[PDB]
Amino acid sequence: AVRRNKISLIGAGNIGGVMAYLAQLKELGDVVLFDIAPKLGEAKALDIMHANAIYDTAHKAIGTANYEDIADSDVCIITAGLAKLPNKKDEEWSRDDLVAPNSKIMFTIGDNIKKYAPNAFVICITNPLDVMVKMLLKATGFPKNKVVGMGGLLDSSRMCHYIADKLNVNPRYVHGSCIGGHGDSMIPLVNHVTVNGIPIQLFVERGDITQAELDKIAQRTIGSGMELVQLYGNGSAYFAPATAAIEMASAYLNDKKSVIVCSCYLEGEYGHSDVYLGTPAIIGANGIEKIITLKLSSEEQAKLDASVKEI
Amino acid sequence: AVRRNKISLIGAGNIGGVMAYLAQLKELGDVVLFDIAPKLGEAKALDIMHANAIYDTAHKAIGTANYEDIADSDVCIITAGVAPNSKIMFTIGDNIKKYAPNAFVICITNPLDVMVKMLLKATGFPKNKVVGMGGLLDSSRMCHYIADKLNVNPRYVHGSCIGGHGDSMIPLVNHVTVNGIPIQLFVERGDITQAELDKIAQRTIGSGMELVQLYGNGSAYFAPATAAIEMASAYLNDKKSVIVCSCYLEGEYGHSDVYLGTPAIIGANGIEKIITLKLSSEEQAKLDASVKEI
Amino acid sequence: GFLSTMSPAVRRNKISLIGAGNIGGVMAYLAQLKELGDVVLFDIAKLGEAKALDIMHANAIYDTAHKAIGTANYEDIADSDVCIITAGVAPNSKIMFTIGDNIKKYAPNAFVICITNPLDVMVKMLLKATGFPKNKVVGMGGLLDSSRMCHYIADKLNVNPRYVHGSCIGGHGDSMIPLVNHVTVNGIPIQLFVERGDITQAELDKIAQRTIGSGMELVQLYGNGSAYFAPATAAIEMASAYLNDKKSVIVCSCYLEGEYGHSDVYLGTPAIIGANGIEKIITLKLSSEEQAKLDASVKEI
Amino acid sequence: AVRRNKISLIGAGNIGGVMAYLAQLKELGDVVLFDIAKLGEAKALDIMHANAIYDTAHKAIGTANYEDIADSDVCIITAGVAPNSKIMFTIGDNIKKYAPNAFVICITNPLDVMVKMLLKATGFPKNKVVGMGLLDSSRMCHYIADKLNVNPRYVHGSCIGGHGDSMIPLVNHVTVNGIPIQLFVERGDITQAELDKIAQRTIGSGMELVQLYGNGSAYFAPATAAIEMASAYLNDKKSVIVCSCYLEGEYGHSDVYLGTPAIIGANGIEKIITLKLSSEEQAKLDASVKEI
């Protein structure tokens, strides 16, 4: 009759571990930590299982390197793929050199999902998001609504945090949308932010924040990734990306119909088609139940056309 | 050097019972179910205490009719209950003045914007420590009706219903937002009509009376109790939540010496700030007409 | 293309509440705030709509996403994963059939949790009316009775009740057997605390006697009506164990077919609740003096 | 009048990272990530982004200056024998100076030895210096719960003694919602020969994950444990937790930390619960105290 939700984390790196950790303490469902190094997933799995006993939670975490174990998964969250190039210096390679290898990686994962988890809600994190997700949509052959990219929730939440940290208010009430591509071409709609429905321009007229501080926030939102790549020294952000993915996986598993900015396959929205792109959407039991097409200005539309053409 | 949060509920009625229940399962702190009918508070305490053992929660709730038991309370929510009710507020606030001289006083009794003023004068506390519960109930009601129509998680539907907690409230429907997106966009896409948005404004005004006639006896209590606990949590935990509630004004909106529902930041200092919304002449007249009713 | 239909692969859990009384209202409240699933408040009377609309207002306050409705029509129970029943011996028994006949028609795959008293008698009337397997028709009582026993101990020991575990078995009534001498505190037998001086055997014996009359103790305290906050928490705690397949160890009224020497009678006993409802019945090793109190409980049932 | 809790973590490593994450998402209080290195600011900022997603209110900051520990309600230690013993004193001397009312929760290994160094450095009372017990005991209950296939929420157990190979997994005293584990042995769900091995696996669990991880050791469960302990102190839960406590006569020993059940509340160690042991179990405890 009923059964536990099954989430497969294709990639048990830094992001994968925190994702399993959160989902288990929230009892969102059983977790499969799939990694090409199986003991890495088995280590976090067993470790998180010891945490469940500490936290009195009932669900199970598994580690594996075999695609048979992600079978019947309701959600597949993908972080696998190349992130670094050890045998070359920082000067001999750019990010464009990993796109093609990662593209083939996205296919192998897609075929196995199509094989073992034909009904899975595929959330992708591997970057470049807007391109990598499109590789999964082809490989999985799933409908438009069951293949989503994670971003915009991370990008918008970062924008809303910087706003909240300045106003000294609970970020629960700072809403905002950062759209476009999940990269340096994103569009932080910082002047459309709202504080519990209150337009941000009000707080400008009050002196709580300044137009200059907003423009600088939009710029720090664009480089938040690299900012943390330089703070960590070795690696990138993972705590917040993990929380974003699990928040999207819960909106699906629980049919919350939450409004999240996600990378979505377009077929006419904003004047584009056949491309993934960050945009607010309604995530529910059918995945992307609805795309909210924002009313952009000519300047904001130009910025959107620019990131689409670099995707 | 650490201590449990203490929440006194002056009034163990239907609202009081749900408040103690939510606070005990959330482990928000100890609860004192104060009521002139001492047994009623004792019943729900022992019943909620049975819930704690089921739900594996550690805090304790008690029932009493002695103000000596609300001593050192961090929060005092009042549901006990115009002229005679006003007098009841002075007796409560005068005891809070003595036993709970540091409590964040939240008022539920109606008329809200008047009773809370009688608690402010009796307790002698500064204005930033005596707040009233309205607007958070009134705004969430509005946000629901819009979420239900849009079929969206109300988590992302924000809105402000200002004014007095009565028929003169001002549901700012046309300023509602969905994940920051203006509500007008959803009108321009067919998801909802301005006519339906105007209908939600009136339903919000009359939501209180709608449930009175649905219940047949009594009124709402699940949502009021839930809002009072959220306000009490933003204080105890210093969350600094933007919550619309009845605040004492000394100039804001052009009014003084009157309690009025406006968005504000609730933190460790109770009301740390008041957010004076930028109102149109259409909204000011509605506000000025609500102050006159108060 | 047929693997790419606009058909949802997941659903919200659906919990129907037959009886929107004081317990029904708290059950809908707790379930909604925990985002456990949609709730259907069913009652013969507006009473279910009032609590639903008021609890939906609470959802907007608490940023919770699930839905609650009121109704007086079994049609809104269809496809419910869980049916919890509080409406309500002879007249109650007949009421339990009508409910059971509709739960069979509309919610043929529901996990039926009974609360109406006499628990052990009403839940059996349900089992016969729905015709479901015995493992999907359970009665709530031992989790309430046991937790009450554990609170009285935790209250005297000044310990978190999260670590106080104990079993109260038998029938949901004066015949219940609260095994106070077997209570454990984070695995530690309570006898140790007796040796430490934190509690006396006399107090333990008296806690057993207070657990039995806890129902009436709150009736006199309430003056009008019985307890409801805890019976609601217990019920939702069990529905959550089913909807989430927690394999939770819960004392509850189960249909026995050999255990404890009895058969064809509902009797409270520790069990394991999961996606199959009652997945295992744990039979406790009873003493001679305890098997006697158990045999008396079945006689009264 | 009131105030956020101040939970400072001396050590922004893997364990320290999961701590801030769990504390922030649970809104248990403000978090401070201290470390010799940027390591704290990275996780503080990364976790601050997570707050905005999870709609949580509290704040986290990284730092490398003990001045940011001032007035900390809790100080959880993971930085790091003789060398790491000097660090405990350096750490303790700062907790003494900036957070003199802090509830100290040590994790650095050897637990029972490193925590005493903190006790003598901070100079705090007996009850305000604990050592994270809850990990070892919970590991035992997981393996039993995994075999029995029951919610570990209802499996209680106590793994007493030192936090090393000399620990005592009391696998035979385990209870399932108060039901003795022997009933499940007579039930067919498990065998005594399997419980004896669960004790061994519990002893070597810390080393099992070091080999699985390959690089470094466990951190998810160790982090969850100390946050539970810190939550039992800040919320005055008076919860029963197995943890390292400074003894003064208990079990026939004194002037030594040792893993034992205890009550944790607003006063830290509210009470030590001395378990009723046998001759075989006391000899193991005596063999552990000597190794500490």
Author numbering:
A (entry chain A): 12 to 322
B (entry chain B): 12 to 92, 110 to 322
C (entry chain C): 4 to 48, 50 to 92, 110 to 322
D (entry chain D): 12 to 48, 50 to 92, 110 to 161, 163 to 322
Relevant lines from the article:
The enzyme is serving as a terminase in anaerobic glycolysis pathway, which performs the reversible catalysis from pyruvate to lactate, with nicotinamide adenine dinucleotide (NAD+) and its reduced form (NADH) as coenzymes (Dando et al., 2001). Apicomplexan parasites rely on anaerobic metabolism to produce ATP for various biochemical processes, and these protozoal LDHs have been considered as ideal potential targets for diagnosis and drug screening (Piper et al., 1999; Dando et al., 2001; Al-Anouti et al., 2004; Cornillot et al., 2012; Witola et al., 2017). BoLDH is a tetrameric enzyme made of four identical subunits and displays 222 (D2) symmetry. Taken together, the studies indicate that Babesia spp. LDHs could serve as a potential drug target for the development of anti-babesial compounds.
The crystal structure of BoLDH apo form (residues Met1 to Gly330) was determined by molecular replacement method and refined to R work and R free factors of 0.236/0.268 using reflections to 2.67 Å resolution (resolution range, 44.11–2.67 Å). The BoLDH crystals belong to the space group P1 with the unit cell parameters a = 81.9, b = 92.3, and c = 109.9 (Å). Two tetramers were observed per asymmetric unit, and each monomer contains a co-factor binding site for the binding of NADH or NAD+ and a substrate binding site for the binding of pyruvate or lactate. As the active-site loop (residues 95–109) in open and disordered state, a poor electron density map for the loop was displayed. In addition, an extra insertion (position 101–105, —DEEWS—) is present in the active-site loop (β4–α3 loop) of BoLDH and creates a larger catalytic pocket than that of mammalian LDHs. Interestingly, the absence of this five-peptide insertion makes the BoLDH lose its catalytic function. An extension of ~15 residues at the N-terminal, named as N-terminal “arm”, was detected in the apo BoLDH structure, and each “arm” was involved in the formation of an extra salt bridge in the way that a proton transfers from the carboxyl group of residue Asp266 to the guanidine group of residue Arg15 at the interface of subunit A and subunit C or subunit B and subunit D. The results together suggest that the N-terminal “arm” structure is contributed to the quaternary stabilization of BoLDH but not an essential factor for the stabilization of R-state conformation. Interestingly, we found that the structure of apo BoLDH takes R state with the active-site loop (β4–α3 loop) open, and the feature is similar to other eukaryotic apo LDHs, such as PfLDH, HuLDH-A, and BmLDH, but obviously different from that of bacterial LDHs in R state with the active-site loop closed. Hence, BoLDH belongs to a group of non-allosteric L-LDHs.
